[PDB]
């Protein structure tokens, strides 16, 4: 039987980048050739595995990490890249062994008047380990003054709002970015092609 992938890509509301939707795919056959042959995505870069020979190989489990970012941070989703989102929201490890898919969705994730439904994390006290989610809303303390949860001087909120609008450029348009991760641990293979 086919692995559930259509409703992942055709989901009505993708999750934000600070809390990305994580799904486990196992005990089925997943044909990644459908995604490549459709070619409905601007980004099909896959480090750690060849863009074509992943289909016939058999893996154990698949992780799908879906989120929405703007245009110019699609480059930031890569091993070794740093940024206010690529480090504070989702840090892809240097030994990434999967693929990342990004496509433009300006007709479904934006509307007139300013779409603020998608958020992002801006300030953090330190870095984050790979495959880690941070939903902490505790006020980032910049200086020595402890504000104790009151917004003010040397205290700014980590989570801001995006700027998704349908009349913007391709560099600030909402792009739906999913991350596929293959684990090759000491487990029998459950997903093939």
């Amino acid at each position, epitope marked *: 039987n086919l692995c559930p992938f259509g409703e992942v890509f055709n989901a009505t509301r993708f999750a934000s980048v600070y809390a990305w939707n994580r799904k486990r795919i196992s005990n089925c056959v997943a044909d990644y050739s459908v995604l490549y042959n459709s070619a409905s995505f601007s980004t099909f870069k896959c480090y750690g595995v060849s863009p074509t020979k992943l289909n016939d190989l058999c893996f154990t489990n698949v992780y*799908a990490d879906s989120f929405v970012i703007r245009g110019d941070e699609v480059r930031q989703i890569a091993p070794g890249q740093t940024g206010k989102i690529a480090d504070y929201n989702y840090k892809l490890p240097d030994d990434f062994t999967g693929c990342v898919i990004a496509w433009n969705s300006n007709n479904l994730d934006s509307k007139v008047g300013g779409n603020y439904n998608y958020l992002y994390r801006l300030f953090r006290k330190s870095n984050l380990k790979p495959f880690e989610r*941070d939903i902490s809303t505790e006020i980032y303390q910049a200086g020595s003054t402890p504000c104790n*949860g009151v917004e003010g001087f040397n205290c700014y909120f980590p989570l801001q709002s995006y700027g998704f609008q349908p009349t913007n450029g391709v560099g600030y348009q909402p792009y739906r970015v999913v991350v596929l991760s293959f684990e090759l641990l000491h487990a029998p293979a459950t997903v093939c092609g």
Partner: antibody
Amino acid sequence: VQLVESGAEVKKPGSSVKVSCKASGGTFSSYAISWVRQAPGQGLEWMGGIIPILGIANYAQKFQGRVTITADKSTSTAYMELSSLRSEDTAVYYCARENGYSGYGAAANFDLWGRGTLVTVSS
Amino acid sequence: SVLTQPPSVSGAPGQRVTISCTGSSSNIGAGYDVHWYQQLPGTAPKLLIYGNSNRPSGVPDRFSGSKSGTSASLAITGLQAEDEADYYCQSYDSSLSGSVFGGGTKLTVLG
């Protein structure tokens, strides 16, 4: 802190309610505020939540347009709007706090809970 | 809901009764923490176990949580009179795109 909710009122088919919440001693900030109802004997599920400082809300799939949730940070309160009241909408509503974290999982957990507003629909 | 719990569990005073939450692969098997909630009868619910293994302040040491694979477990080492409650497991889901609770487990101490 403690969260104060309104009393119990009866309602009619159609119409709307204005369930509110109030946090004693302030502290209605840097924390998401979610609303969870307790159905009479069939469990609990999550209506939605707002990050009150940013003023942006999120909802579930079965309650995306039927329910509207608003916040007001000046008086440390949140106003719940529930239009289209039927018979299965009779339940008790709670305003719960959120405690986000960086743990790998990082799942939303409700630390503090309100008193509970019982809303019932009768003809 | 998607998260499945036993409808009720029998209570043996002074022994261990394990409450399980066998969810799907997109909520528990994905990696989200399974937060255990306990509600006293005629009382507002409160956070019993958070972080999937860690205990909030004001929570007795008898209640401990553990999740392996796509199933979670609540350990109750000691069974006293005030443990009469319904236990819910809460986890974030990707397909549902929101936090969902369980079906409840009525821990009924004998008498």
